[PDB]
Enzyme design. Structure first.
Site, mmCIF file in Angstrom:
data_model
loop_
_atom_site.group_PDB
_atom_site.id
_atom_site.type_symbol
_atom_site.label_atom_id
_atom_site.label_comp_id
_atom_site.label_asym_id
_atom_site.label_seq_id
_atom_site.Cartn_x
_atom_site.Cartn_y
_atom_site.Cartn_z
ATOM 1 C CB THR A 1 -26.176 -35.472 -1.427
ATOM 2 O OG1 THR A 1 -25.381 -35.418 -2.619
ATOM 3 C CG2 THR A 1 -26.625 -36.926 -1.272
ATOM 4 C CE1 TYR B 1 -21.303 -29.539 -6.519
ATOM 5 C CE2 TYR B 1 -22.834 -28.641 -4.907
ATOM 6 C CZ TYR B 1 -22.531 -29.533 -5.870
ATOM 7 O OH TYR B 1 -23.425 -30.489 -6.098
ATOM 8 C CE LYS C 1 -19.957 -32.032 -4.585
ATOM 9 N NZ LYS C 1 -21.197 -31.839 -3.858
ATOM 10 C CB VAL D 1 -17.545 -33.843 -2.457
ATOM 11 C CG1 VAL D 1 -18.820 -33.660 -1.611
ATOM 12 C CG2 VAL D 1 -16.460 -32.904 -1.986
#
Ligand SMILES: [Mn+2]
Ligand SMILES: [Mn+2]
Ligand SMILES: [Mn+2]
Ligand SMILES: [Mn+2]
Ligand SMILES: [Mn+2]
Ligand SMILES: [Mn+2]
Ligand SMILES: [Mn+2]
Ligand SMILES: [Mn+2]
Ligand SMILES: [Mn+2]
Ligand SMILES: [Mn+2]
Ligand SMILES: [Mn+2]
Ligand SMILES: [Mn+2]
Ligand SMILES: [Mn+2]
Ligand SMILES: [Mn+2]
Lengths: 295, 295, 295, 295
Positions: free
Chosen positions: B48, B137, B165, B207
């Site tokens: 992001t 992740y 995540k 998240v």
């Protein structure tokens, strides 16, 4: 009230004798057992009930056998859907007359109707018996076509279409349906491993296979959740998760019929073209079931 | 204590000035805003935050600026992953000296390592800074490879690997991990629309991207759920769902940066090869945000 | 003519010593061997060349080693792409100066640029060295993003973008590209098992992995096809098909490095996070290779 | 000789009158047209012929009418498959007495039988009429199950199983089957856009929808290819590709029936639950057909 089927709906298996005929006496004994061990409502001749390979005569008789067996303890939903609209309507009408409390209507498999044609199909079935509740059943993995949330939202405007068995595995879709439908319209999980997650976003319950084996535990999970005991619910989910997966290691209802057989139920094998559980499947189920003290 | 990041981790955007350079002043100001409005922990230079197009010096500088901006109030996790293990290690070593509280380690993208390779990758990063918490992740849609639950389970045996995540969208996978890992290992939703359903099966939180805009409502939803107000949680989830979807109408973080701009934040555009939100997209966003009273 | 790279383009592996450093002398010996056994053009530091885990310095030196080795026998395309536009441009410029005959430019992996951003990315790289041929490389399975035919059709209007390595596996897409691009723009198969089918709809050839082993047979297949001996071509395809599959039983270039090792090449293992071929993989390759008299 | 159906098999539409009843006069007239314009063999009541919504009496009647209409000029294959093995057998027995030259047997849809079940299904159908050729039909997108190549390979050992209509889109699968089956067993494309690429790896031809409109150009493409005019074949393929795509813009046979209507054939609408071509679709069709001089 006419639309309230409880929270555990069990898609019952269809037991067969050694000669392959329907075993009506076992079906009765199974139906009574289920209804005393967590099933609120019986879904008869669903996918799990081997609908595609049953004759209409065998379906009619199964609906009658179950209705007689579970009179005033559980409601009975009849699997009446088809990829032909005329055939579904015919089946729904016949089921209506013998007293079923609703029908389960699968999205037309194999022919992949566009959304407009899916709308008309379900509308026409609804209107053929406007007082009989109708549960939509979306299972893209088997039908080759998804029922869109927009289409479901429109069909929920028809008073007797009282919910969807959502077996697409897409929670976004289920949430889009939930947020734009009235409360009289209920979402049920169509996969046992998604019951808890779908409850979390507003589903009513599950049209279950696993409930044949752990229906009292599914009740406990759902009641736990609804009363705010979220970690009790998650504990039960996580404890059952290996069973839920074992029940789809090969195509349902092949595993569940093997599981029931391991507990002594005489349910027969599945009917062609479904084939028997191989040794692998049986051993995996045994270990999981033993681990849960189901055998 | 050390692996405790709370329940809302925000994957903060990286703002840029009109010339494309990093806007450190807005970074600081956004970090302080977030942490006063729902964010427990900031994840800096994740996907992001446009990690792929930032220089290592820009990332180092961001880590320092955010950490110092929110020290005492929140933790900072540094995005330090790579599809080269040596690069991830070097980035992780440097993050650790900055004083951040953990690293976020994406599964290697593009090169599709087998599970044994993924295990060794993560283990080597964990071992290079054995006292720095490491959050896995998993985002197969971007990397082209899924981290298997067996692999995650083995990795959670390493002391400083304290969670995943999970952005696969696969709720069975998450459940598999949750049932076989110790309670020090936490699962976070990697998709804002999956926070509630994952929470229901034992995830810790999210998240988040959406927390830039509705962090306090996310806090409310998560807190409601954990205390058993399950319908309050599902009401919030359903109300926010159109926002969650709108934030992924084109590739994150294009929409969120446009949502922030609509509110007056000077975040700039994304950096090439990410392109600007076309007008349709901005109009979709504007409508959903107006409807939620976010503008 | 500047754009003509032949029909067999080999994405060469990168051999490593026991200490894991680049083995330049083996790379030279392999390059010469390939160019004498069916390779028209060498694609250096592609995916198969373990680009993600090489340093820029190792890439530069590999391009130089190969150019020196294959001077006036084969052209050399340099893998220079990135998910950062600025990094790709930098790499392309550096490669241009040392004499490469083109660059292979992967679609930005992991960040999922929209089509407009993909257009600008490739446009900018093309324009940074407007005289250097540029081969687009679409591999959605690894990048998480597909390059659309419309976008490719537009990029083919830029004079030095002379084709696409199409590794999406979608023949519709390849045909849509073929029918709307000029003849100076060439399509290459990016999967060895699709070379023949893509030839049938107008592709030029293949950017091959298998050519390390059966490059003379791939020539024979393509020449057979182009001269109208369609059943000779299909016979070769069907005979090689098991090798083509074996070469992707685990992530390329893990199998091909094992295959070469079985023929005595000292290519080392792959670099972390890629892991060594397990015994299974090796035994499957051996049997297939033996069956084709490659060992 | 007996399994020889030529190279263009047309899956003929079923025309309906304004009242929804089958139009046997147009059926005959369309059958005669097709067989004079590129069609070697007619496949009657396949998916394209709206088998799911026809009654068994309507199918029987179609088989009789088409067979008699084209006897001496072409063969007729009867769609007789089902997801119930007993039903497929009964339909196959009856087709055989009508005097048709083969049956088309879809993989069971909806119930997802394991491979062992699929093997037994097909074998039992083959054995019920051991002298009637049987063409397998694999279309996983509609059935929800893929027929594995190992299974196809075992089935091709049964004398009267003489090929597969392969509509998986998987060219590796097709190649796997082609290399391990005898030459009496033929592979047909189940998708018009895959005819040329499949031909290149050893397929015989296509079971086609587009041949209703460009049967002669399909014949030309296939004949060009087999005689080694590979660029003539690819020119035809590329020229027709927009038509091939337009015929699947919504679910077949909705577009093709609208294409036929644009040319003046009175084919009626599809039957519920298939809905009519919206205006966008008809406009897309019209443009592509105008551009090809089909109207
Ligand atoms: Mn039935
Ligand atoms: Mn039925
Ligand atoms: Mn029981
Ligand atoms: Mn906090
Ligand atoms: Mn960076
Ligand atoms: Mn970086
Ligand atoms: Mn500061
Ligand atoms: Mn590199
Ligand atoms: Mn590089
Ligand atoms: Mn060699
Ligand atoms: Mn003929
Ligand atoms: Mn029929
Ligand atoms: Mn029929
Ligand atoms: Mn006649």
């Amino acid at each position: 009230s006419v639309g309230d089927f409880g929270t555990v709906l069990t898609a019952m298996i269809t037991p067969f004798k050694a000669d392959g005929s329907v075993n009506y006496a076992v079906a009765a004994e199974l139906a009574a057992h289920l209804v005393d061990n967590g099933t609120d409502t019986l879904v008869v001749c669903g996918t799990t009930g081997e609908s595609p390979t049953l004759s209409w005569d065998e379906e009619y008789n199964l609906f009658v056998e179950v209705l007689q067996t579970v009179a005033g303890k559980a409601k009975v939903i009849a699997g009446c859907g088809s990829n032909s609209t005329k055939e579904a309507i015919a089946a729904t009408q016949k089921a209506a007359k013998i007293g079923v409390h609703g029908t389960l209507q699968v999205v037309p498999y194999y022919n992949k109707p566009p959304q407009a044609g899916l709308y008309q199909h379900f509308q026409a079935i609804a209107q053929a018996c406007p007082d009989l509740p109708l549960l939509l059943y979306n299972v893209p993995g088997r039908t080759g076509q998804n029922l869109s949330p927009e289409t479901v939202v429109r069909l929920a405007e028809i008073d007797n279409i009282i919910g969807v068995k959502e077996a697409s595995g897409n929670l976004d879709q289920a949430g889009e349906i939930r947020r734009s439908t009235p409360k009289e319209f209920q979402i049920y999980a169509g996969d046992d491993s998604l019951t808890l997650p779908l409850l979390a976003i507003g589903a009513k319950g599950v049209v279950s296979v696993a409930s044949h084996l752990v229906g009292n535990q599914l009740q406990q999970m759902i009641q736990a959740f609804n009363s705010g005991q979220v970690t009790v619910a998650s504990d039960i989910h996580l404890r059952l998760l290996p069973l839920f997966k074992a029940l789809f290691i090969t195509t349902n209802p092949i595993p569940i019929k093997q599981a029931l057989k391991l507990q002594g139920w005489e349910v027969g094998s599945t009917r062609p073209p479904l084939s028997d559980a191989d040794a692998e499947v049986s051993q995996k189920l045994e270990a999981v079931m033993k681990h849960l003290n189901l055998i």
